[model samples]
Target chain A: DLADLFPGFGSEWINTSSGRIFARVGGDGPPLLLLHGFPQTHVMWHRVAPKLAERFKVIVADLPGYGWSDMPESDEQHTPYTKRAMAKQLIEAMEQLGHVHFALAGHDRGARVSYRLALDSPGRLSKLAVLDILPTYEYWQRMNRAYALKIYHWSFLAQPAPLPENLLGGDPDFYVKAKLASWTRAGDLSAFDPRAVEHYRIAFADPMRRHVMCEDFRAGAYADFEHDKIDVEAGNKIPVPMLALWGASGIAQSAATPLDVWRKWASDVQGAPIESGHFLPEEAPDQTAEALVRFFS
Target chain B: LADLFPGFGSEWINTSSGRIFARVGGDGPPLLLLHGFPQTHVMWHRVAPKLAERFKVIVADLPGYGWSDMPESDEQHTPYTKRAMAKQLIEAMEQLGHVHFALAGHDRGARVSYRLALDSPGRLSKLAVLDILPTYEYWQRMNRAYALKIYHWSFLAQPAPLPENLLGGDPDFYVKAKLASWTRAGDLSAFDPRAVEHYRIAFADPMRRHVMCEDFRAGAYADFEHDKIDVEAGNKIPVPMLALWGASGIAQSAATPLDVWRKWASDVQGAPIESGHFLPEEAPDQTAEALVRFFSA
Candidate 1:
C-alpha cells in the first residue's frame, strides 16, 4: 500500500527471449525509453518521468538483474549482463510494445545499456542520451591511482563473484547507504525521497540482487569492456544523435568536458554539465528532464 | 607463551622515521625476511627458523603492517610506498647493526626489497622475492584474469575509510577469507590460529585498517611511479635477484611471474614452487631451501 513510487504509471512485465522485464509505461506521445543504473531501480525516474510523460510516452524499465526483472542464467563470461545482451532484450521489449524505433536515455549502468543498444542497433534508436558515464573501455583505460580510489567499487564489485557479494551481503545497509551518500553533491541522502530509498534498499537486500549486481560489474570489467574496446578499435561509432548529460559535481565532471569524451564514440553528440551529483535524474530531475526533452525533440 | 619463532628474540628497532617490530635469531651473514598482505611476519615464521640455522635471520613486519608503527601518509601517499618502506627497512637494519644484508621478501615485503635493491644498490648482497612480480608489471599488465586474481590491489587501494570501513566490519571473517583462498591447502589449515589472531588484531582497529589500505594506495601510485620511472630509465636492479612464485599462485595466473621479473632485474633466476600464494607458510621447507640456494649461490 505504501511502496508505489511510480504512481498511476501502468505496469507491464514484457516477456523477452532473455527474461521477463518489468516496465512502467505512461504518457501518450512519441515512444521514449528510459533505463536505470546500478544500486538503483527504475523507481529512480519517479522524480523525472512524470514531467517527460506530459509530452513523450515514457517507458521506464529495470535493466536485467534489477528490480522486478528476471535474471537469465549468466555464462562464464558473464555475457548475459553485458550491455550488448541487455540491449538485445531492450530491442525485443520495445518491439513487443509496438515500437520498432524510439529515443532512449539511461543513467549509470543503464547508460551503458543505452549506448550499447545504440551501437548494436543504431537503426532502432532515433536518439540516444547517456547520463553520468563514459564508454566502458575508457574507464578501465583511465583507472589511474586517483580515479581508482574514487571509483574503487568498480573493481570491488567486479571481483570474482561471491567475494564482493558476500562482502556487501554482510552489511548491505551500510554499503548501499554509503554509496548513495558519497556520490551526491550534497554528500548525503537529502536528494532522495524516503520511498525511493526504500525501493533501492529492498532491491539490495536480496542475495540474488546482490549476486547479479556483481555479475553486472563482472561483465563490465570483462565482457562489456571488450565490446567497447573492439568497437572503438573498429571505429564503430554511435550513428544516432547522442546527448551526454552529467552531474556538475558527479563522476563524469572530472573530464574537462563530458562532450569531449562522448565525441570519441559518436558522430552527432553534445551535452552540458548539470548542477548535481552522480544521480542526475534524481538529484537534478527538472534539469535532467528538460535536457532530455530538448534532445529527444 | 609458545613463541612460533622458538629461539628468536623480538625487538623494536627505532629508525629515523618510525619504528619496526622484528623477531631476530641465529648468526652468520644477516638475512632479512619480509612478509605479504592480509598477514604479517608470522608468515615467515615457518621459514625463518630454518633460515636462521644458516644465517642471522630477521623477520620484520613491513611498515604499517602487523606491530610496526603506522606512519600517517599524505594525499599523495608518499610515506607508505615501497620506496619509502624500503628506505625505512634499510635504516632499521642499519640501526640493528646489519648495514648490508641478503634480503628475502614475500608479497609486499618483496615489493620493498626490490625497490631497496634499486634505490640503495649497495645495501643488499642478494635479493630473493617470493611469489611476486614487480609493481610496474602488475599494474601495466592487469588483464581480466589478473584483475580478478588480484582485485584487492585495486579494492584495498581505494581511498581511506571506505575499504577500511568495509574490511573492519568483520576483520576475522576477512582474515579467514584470505587464509582460505591464498594457500595450497585452500583453507585455514596452513596457518596457526594464533598467527591468524595477529592478522585479526590489525583489521579490528579502524585506524590500523586504514594504514593497510594506504599501504595499497601507495602501491598503486608512488610505488608504480617509482617502478615506471626505473623501467623507463632502464634502471634494472643491480644486485643478484631470485624470483619464486607458487606454481598455482595468483601471480602465475597471468603471465609467467619469472618472465616479468627478468625485465626489471639484470641478474635474476627463479622457478615456480609447488604451492599457492603463501609459499612461505604453505611450503616453508621448500621456500627456505630456495632462499638458501639463491642467497648462498
Candidate 2:
C-alpha cells in the first residue's frame, strides 16, 4: 500500500556507465530526485522520499561507488569521486532512464553532488535543495578547531596515504556511531530507527565504499574546489529555485551560517536548519519532509 | 501583581557581583526582587515599584540571559549542566558587578540562585531558590511528565544547532514554547514578556542558539557525570541555603527537602511558597518575605 503510494520505488536497479544504480522511485506529478549522502545508499532517503512521493514522482538513487552500486574495478576508474563528476554521472544515469529534467533534493554527501548537478546541469533541475553543506572551498577556507572536530573525516581521509582505510576498518561503524552519538542531544539518536543504521552498515560495509569516501573527500579538497571556483569566478548562476536546508548542530559550515555561502551560487536560494545529527532525513523526518514538501510545492 | 519596595534605580553594592537593576522607591529596608526564567531585570515592574515605597528593591537578569551575553562563545558552549550555568551567574555577580545581594530565582534562575548559596555561602545576605531541588536529587527524581517537560533540559543542552536547528524554523517558538508551556497553571500571567523576549533574541541566530543548548547538553550528560565524580571525590557547597517550591506545581522536590539541601549546602532552610512553580512572580511578596527573613538569619 505504501509503496504503491509512490510508484516505481524500492528494489529497482538501473545500469549506467559507472555501474548499477540501486533506485527507488514512486509518487506522481512532476519528477523529483532524492540523492543520498556519504557512507549511505539510496535508502538514506527512505524516510523522506516516500513522504514526498505522495505529491511528486520521487526517484532516489545510489551514486556510482556507494550502496548497491558495483565498486569500480581499478584505481583508474576510482581516481576521483568528486561531486562535480558524480553530478555529471548522476545526470547521465537519470537521462538514460528517460528522466532528463526534475526537481531534486540531497543530503550530506548527496547534497554536495546535488550542488554540482545544479551547477553543471542547471537546465535539468527545475528546483534544487541541498542539505547541510557549503562549497568545499568555503569549508576548507574556514577550517578551525570546532569545524575540524565536527567534520574530522575530511582531513583524515584526504591524506596521501592509507590511514583512512586503516582507521575505518578498525570499526566500520566508528564514524557513523561516533558522529551520531556525540553530535546530537542526549536522546535524539535513540529516536532513530535501528534498521536505518543497519541500512548504513549494509551500504558502507565494504572497504571499496570506504576508499570511495576517501576519494570523495579528497576530490572535494582538490579538483571539486577548483571546479566550483571556476564557475564562481565566471559568475555562473544555477538558474533554479534552490532551497538549502542545513542542521543547526551540523558541521560548523552546514550550521545556520553556512546558508550564506550558498547564496552566491543561486539568486533564488532559500535555506533553514533542521535539528538532528548528520542524518537529517532519518532524525527529523517529519519536519524534514514538511520543509521539503512545502519548499517544493 | 507587582508592588514597589525600594532601590528602584538606586545602585547598591551587589555582593552577587552581577547586574542587579536596582529600583529603590519604598521607605523601609529594600525588598530585593531577584527574577528567574522568561523574566528579567524588569520582571519586578509592578511589584518592585510598589515594594520600593517601603524597602529598597532590586531586579536582575541572570548571566548569559536577558541583557547578558548568553555567552555564545565556543569556550562557554559546554556548560556541563545547570550548575555550570549557575557558576556563570555567580562569577558574573561576584567578579563583574560585585553583587552579594539577597537572592531568589525561578525555574532555571532559581537553580542558579540555589547554586550561588552552595558555591559561595557568605556572599549573600539572604538566598532563595524558587522551584528547584539540589542538582543530584533532581536527577534522581525524574518522572515521565518532568522527563517530558524538561526534554530540552536534555535537548537544548545538546551540542548546538541540533538543539538549535530542531528549533530552527521558528527559533523563538522553541524558547517560548519550552518556557510558556512547561509551567503549571496560573503562573503564565506571572511570567514577564520582556524576560521571554530576551530568550527569543538570545537564540534567534542558530549558532548562538546552539551554544546555549550546548551548555545544557554538557551539563546534563557529561557534566552530570563529572559532578557525580566530584561528589564521590567529596565535594559540597558551604553556605546557608533556602529552597522554595510551589504547592500547585510538582510538589517542589520531596517531603524531606531539607535533608536533600543538606547534601549539597553546609546550611539549609526552605518551605512551600504556596504558589505554582513561578514562586517569584506569582508570590513575589511572600517570596520576598521569606528571603528577607532567611538571609537576616
Best by lDDT: 1
* Candidate 2 TM-score versus the reference: 0.48
- Candidate 1 lDDT for residue A82: 90
User: What ranges in model 1 sit over 4 Å off?
Assistant: A1-20, A70-80, A91-96, A120-123, A141-150, A185-195, A226-238, A247-276, B14-19, B71-79, B142-145, B184-208, B228-236, B250-267
Model 2 C-alpha lDDT per residue in residues A37-69, reported as the tens digit of each score: 776667667778878988998888887688777
Q: Which has the greatest TM-score?
A: 1
Interface RMSD of each: 2.8, 17.5
Model 1 C-alpha lDDT per residue in residues B78-97, reported as the tens digit of each score: 77888899889998998988
| Docking class for candidate 2 | incorrect
Off by over 4 Å in 2: A1-8, A73-80, A251-256, B1-297
Q: Cα deviation in Å at residue B249, candidate 2?
A: 65
**A1-297: candidate 1 lDDT, tens digit per residue:** 337767669999998999989989999899999999989999999988988888899999999879999989988999889999999988898889999989899999999999998888899989999999988888877776455657767888987766777677667877788888789999889999988888888889898988889889989888898889889889888889999998878864453577888898999999988999999988898899899888887
